[PDB]
Amino acid sequence: AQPKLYVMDNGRMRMDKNWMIAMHNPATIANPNAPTEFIEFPIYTVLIDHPEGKILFDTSCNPDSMGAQGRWGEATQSMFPWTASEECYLHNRLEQLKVRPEDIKFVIASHLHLDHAGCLEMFTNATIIVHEDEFSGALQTYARNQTEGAYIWGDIDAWIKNNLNWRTIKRDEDNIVLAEGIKILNFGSGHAWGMLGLHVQLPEKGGIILASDAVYSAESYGPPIKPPGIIYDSLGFVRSVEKIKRIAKETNSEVWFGHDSEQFKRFRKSTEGYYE
Amino acid sequence: AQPKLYVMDNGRMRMDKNWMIAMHNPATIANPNAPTEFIEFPIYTVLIDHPEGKILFDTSCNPDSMGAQGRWGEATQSMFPWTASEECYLHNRLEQLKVRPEDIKFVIASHLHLDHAGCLEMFTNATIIVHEDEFSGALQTYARNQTEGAYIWGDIDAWIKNNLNWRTIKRDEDNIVLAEGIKILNFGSGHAWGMLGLHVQLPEKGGIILASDAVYSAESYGPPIKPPGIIYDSLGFVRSVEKIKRIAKETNSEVWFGHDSEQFKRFRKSTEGYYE
Amino acid sequence: QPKLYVMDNGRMRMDKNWMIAMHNPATIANPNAPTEFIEFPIYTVLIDHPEGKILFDTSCNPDSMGAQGRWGEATQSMFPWTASEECYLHNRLEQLKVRPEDIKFVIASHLHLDHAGCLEMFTNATIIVHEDEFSGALQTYARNQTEGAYIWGDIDAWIKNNLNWRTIKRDEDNIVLAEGIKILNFGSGHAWGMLGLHVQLPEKGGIILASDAVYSAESYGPPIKPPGIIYDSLGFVRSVEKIKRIAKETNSEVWFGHDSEQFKRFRKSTEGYYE
Ligand SMILES: [Co+2]
Ligand SMILES: [Co+2]
Ligand SMILES: [Co+2]
Ligand SMILES: [Co+2]
Ligand SMILES: [Co+2]
Ligand SMILES: [Co+2]
């Protein structure tokens, strides 16, 4: 048995382009009221069907995110609307691959934002792997009863109700081997409090770095590096992009970005196949 | 549950181009000794993982075909050499999809030539679907202990020893529905004594006709139609190509040829995915 | 100016080794050395200050003990809390004619069962806690841990009651809350993040509320004697040294977390207050 890697399409989000690429079109004396753009980008997840056990990188958005009775706050829904047909929901993408959520051994939470941790609550047999400081930060938003923003109260509530098995990656812990050719990369603070990536070595495809929101897009990645409009730790963000570039070169790996529309079009998706 | 169709690469064969396209390069006064060429073409099989049960179309060549102790006769090996790495063997292609031979419900033997019926002996639980006249003709070769040619004595011997569950399609029987969107096409005599094809209707991809050796290649298909060298029933061969064209037009189906190098290159193979 | 009250919130018992590590080691003459089950006070301190009332610690929740109690049964068997109704914090404050709604700041020295038990009462105050203590306690909650020093049911109630939190940052110290009231950040030691309070009273002078940064006079020494089970042993020692330094530089008295003999000497809220 050999691994197969799947890219699952979990719909699309839109938002002010400045969130993705800070100051992408600044006002000038000639164009003082420069309008921004409302860009569309993909939300996706990666399943590695590995002989040692199934590994899921990220979990997309909860199906109960949007709408008047949705878990996401109304301002959040207005600034980051998520559009997804039933087929796009992670539970349906998995069902079409005949993969039971009960058979997922590990889930890597790159971070705990609304569009990456939305379906953690499905995976009650998995070890949920997360950066310790990201876990702390998200839990504080919950304890403070925050109803708006990128950390979703109702999602966190469900994680606790469902008694998930958590494994926290310590801030000083890196290059954590989970299975043959599967290694967690600890990027630390930058985009959020604590970012994790994944390096996957496939027999045929070779090396892949799942960067998630440590690098939103090829435009972010550069050079030159272009940071996002809201950033927790700007210096850490730059260091993390530099680290990813270094690992990519040393290991001859492709870097898969968090939300790059053009790159995502190129992926073979789970409705067509997989990477071996 | 939805069907997934897989194209499995079972290696390459070479042979005189005149076998594929009769009289492709006739001698002339200026070129009286016109040399032929030794072309290479693919051997492949198709698995339809259908919710009603797995269906296999053709079975490629037996792994014990070639070599001094192989089942194929010496002269046959010299004229139709098959080259295949271990990974190309059908049992290995199926195992990499986690499909056991015992899981196959139907095998369609398009005909009983060495490169389509080579692995029937693996499928001891399946119903083996074959044209009655093709079955009769192959069995007579066996009874005559024929050691050379396209019908392999050792393969046939193994089918009998393994007591396969044959269903013969009668010469006047056509359009045999096996499962939702899976229909057997009876082309009758032409390339061989009795040729079967399959029409597959997939939700997304639409209609596919699996022609096997009723149409070797796009060059065979034309227009103009170009018949193969060595042909059992030349009138039936033409009738069958015209039947395939008619069905393809009426159902808006793509025709997948038996041995077309360029078409085969375009297929998504089982190492990369499937058609839905 | 301000009045300071010491409120008696009952008594707890536990293995002495929890308080003083290796207090009575086995020897060849005494290979099966027995320990003892010591008793100590749980208490809280109210400072009635003109700029707003400040409460240091909150004792145990009235619903802690019993078959239906919030504390886990192993926890109740190892750290049993005994308290009459009049010992409950809500009753101690009622006797002082202080409304819980009138507490401006509550200082959570840390989030252990016997200090954070009644945070949920104070839905109008700012609850002040070390950021790393808050994080740690919240992780135990998210993991649904029902035994130990961090009480799942208490935490559940802080969240359900929508308390107003102010986290003291890891590198933040000497935080003036009011004239003569300063938060002392001791950091990691006994727990993930310990806070103390320096109180300057007009007549009594300086008081340092150490809570569990220093359990007792025997802990404080010299020589310093650390507790059994300790988060950060180096930090624990550094914090005791810090307290000794501040006490000497400010001429302040150090009030320990759980010292039976010291607690007996305090003027209790039922008799009067400090000025
Ligand atoms: Co993000
Ligand atoms: Co994102
Ligand atoms: Co043939
Ligand atoms: Co053939
Ligand atoms: Co304590
Ligand atoms: Co204590």
Author numbering:
A (entry chain H), B (entry chain A): 8 to 283
C (entry chain L): 9 to 283
Study text:
AaL (WP_021296945.1) is a lactonase isolated from the acidophilic, moderately thermostable bacterium Alicyclobacillus acidoterrestris. The quorum quenching lactonase AaL from the thermoacidophilic bacterium Alicyclobacillus acidoterrestris exhibits a very broad substrate range, being capable of hydrolyzing short and long chain AHLs with high proficiencies. AaL possesses a bi-metallic active site center. We show that AaL is capable of degrading δ-lactones and γ-lactones with high catalytic proficiency (>104 M−1 s−1) and shows some weak, promiscuous phosphotriesterase activity on the insecticide-derivated paraoxon. The crystal structure of AaL reveals a unique hydrophobic patch which could relate to its high specificity, and highlights a flexible active site loop which may be involved in substrate binding.
Examination of one of the obtained AaL structure reveals the presence of a tetrahedral molecule in the active site, as clearly illustrated by the electronic density. Similarly to what was observed in the AiiB structure, this density was attributed to a phosphate anion. In this structure, the α-metal is bridged with H118, H120, H198, D220 and two phosphate oxygen atoms, while the β-metal is bound to H123, H266, D122, D220 and two oxygen atoms from the phosphate anion. With the bound phosphate, the bridging water molecule is not present in the metal coordination. Interestingly, the phosphate-bound AaL and AiiB structures differ in the way they coordinate the anion. However, in the case of AaL, the corresponding residue, a leucine, does not interact with the bound anion. In fact, metal coordination is affected and the distance between both metal cations varies greatly between the two enzymes (3.5 Å and 4.2 Å in AaL and AiiB, respectively, for the two phosphate-bound structures).
